[PDB]
Every structure is written in C-alpha cells, then in structure tokens.
Amino acid sequence: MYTREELMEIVSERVKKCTACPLHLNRTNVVVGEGNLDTRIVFVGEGPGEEEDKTGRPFVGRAGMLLTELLRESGIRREDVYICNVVKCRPPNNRTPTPEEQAACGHFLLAQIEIINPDVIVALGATALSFFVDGKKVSITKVRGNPIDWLGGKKVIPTFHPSYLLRNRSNELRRIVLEDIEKAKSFIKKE
Numbered sequence: 001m002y003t004r005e006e007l008m009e010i011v012s013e014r015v016k017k018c019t020a021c022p023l024h025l026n027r028t029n030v031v032v033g034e035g036n037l038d039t040r041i042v043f044v045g046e047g048p049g050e051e052e053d054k055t056g057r058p059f060v061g062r063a064g065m066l067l068t069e070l071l072r073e074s075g076i077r078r079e080d081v082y083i084c085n086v087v088k089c090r091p092p093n094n095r096t097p098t099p100e101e102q103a104a105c106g107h108f109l110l111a112q113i114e115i116i117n118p119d120v121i122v123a124l125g126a127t128a129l130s131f132f133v134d135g136k137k138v139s140i141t142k143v144r145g146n147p148i149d150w151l152g153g154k155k156v157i158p159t160f161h162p163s164y165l166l167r168n169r170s171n172e173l174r175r176i177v178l179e180d181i182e183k184a185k186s187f188i189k190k191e
C-alpha cells in the first residue's frame with residue numbers, strides 16, 4: 001500500500017514548500033535528514049549550519065564530522081542509523097532557533113519519528129532536549145545521561161551536542177558523551 005520511503009519523501013516535499021516560520025526566508029536548502037529508515041536508534045540535533053545548508057544534508061560540517069567519529073567509536077556506522085534536527089532551515093548567521101521557530105517545525109520531526117518508529121532517541125543538545133520535554137526549560141548539563149520516557153515507551157537519552165566537544169576538547173567530556181551513547185544502545189530492543 002505504502003512504503004516508508006514514500007512517506008519520508010512526502011515529508012521532504014512538504015518541508016521544501018514550508019514557510020511556516022521566518023527561517024524559510026533565509027535557508028538555501030532544507031535539511032530533512034538521512035540514514036537507515038529501519039534503524040532502532042535516531043540521532044536528533046538542533047538545526048542546519050553552513051555546510052548542511054549548502055549540501056541539504058545533516059551533520060556534514062565540523063560538528064557533523066565529529067559526530068561521525070563518536071558514532072564510529074560507539075561501534076556505529078552512519079549508514080546504519082538515522083540523523084535529523086529539530087528545525088529544517090538554517091537561521092541567519094547560524095543564530096540559535098527561536099522557541100517559536102522550534103515549535104512550528106516540530107511536527108515534521110514527529111512524523112519522521114513516526115515513520116521510523118525507533119526504540120530509542122539520542123538528543124544532542126538543549127534544543128533537541130526541549131522538544132522531548134514539551135518545549136519546557138531544562139539544563140542540558142543537569143539532565144544529560146538520564147533516560148526519559150517518551151511516547152510509545154520509546155526512550156530518549158539526552159547528551160551534549162557535538163558542537164560542544166568542538167569547543168572543549170577534554171577527553172573526560174568525550175568519554176561522557178560516548179558513555180551516554182552506549183546507554184542509548186542498551187535500550188535498543190534485543191533482536
């Protein structure tokens with residue numbers, strides 16, 4: 001009747017046509033997401049940076065390159081999971097997306113998660129965090145590492161955004177993130 005591929009494409013087409021928030025006026029290309037539509041684990045960030053915007057792909061910038069390594073160091077191949085963000089359009093001067101802008105785009109993420117139906121989601125960053133606590137304010141630093149019960153029994157593991165490890169290069173910091181990723185993997189349901 002219908003395939004996951006087709007539904008994601010519909011999401012994709014509606015995004016390219018979206019003008020729901022101010023961010024549509026700035027971006028060069030929308031960044032929907034990429035990966036395995038059958039992964040049991042999804043990674044979600046904040047939004048498009050300069051490279052993402054140019055390639056229309058997620059996490060291709062320096063932060064993305066770093067994320068690739070964290071995944072590799074967690075026994076994970078990019079091609080095996082799915083990667084996306086809370087907002088699809090790049091804000092001017094890469095400023096942080098406004099909560100309003102965040103609220104307007106969210107329905108897309110929801111559909112994506114709906115289509116993939118994963119066992120666990122990793123929230124990279126505070127923005128990714130807000131989305132899973134209903135926009136509410138929460139300190140990424142205080143909650144990182146603690147599993148959150150989300151819809152359909154799915155678990156969300158919040159952790160730091162790769163962008164942070166670009167800034168602070170301490171090994172302790174990298175170890176914590178990896179620890180959090182391992183944590184999420186433990187929630188993937190055994191075969």
Ligand code: SF4
Pocket residue numbers: 015018019020021022023024025030087088089101104105
């Ligand atoms: S950021 Fe999202 S809600 Fe705003 S114009 Fe882009 S696709 Fe639409």
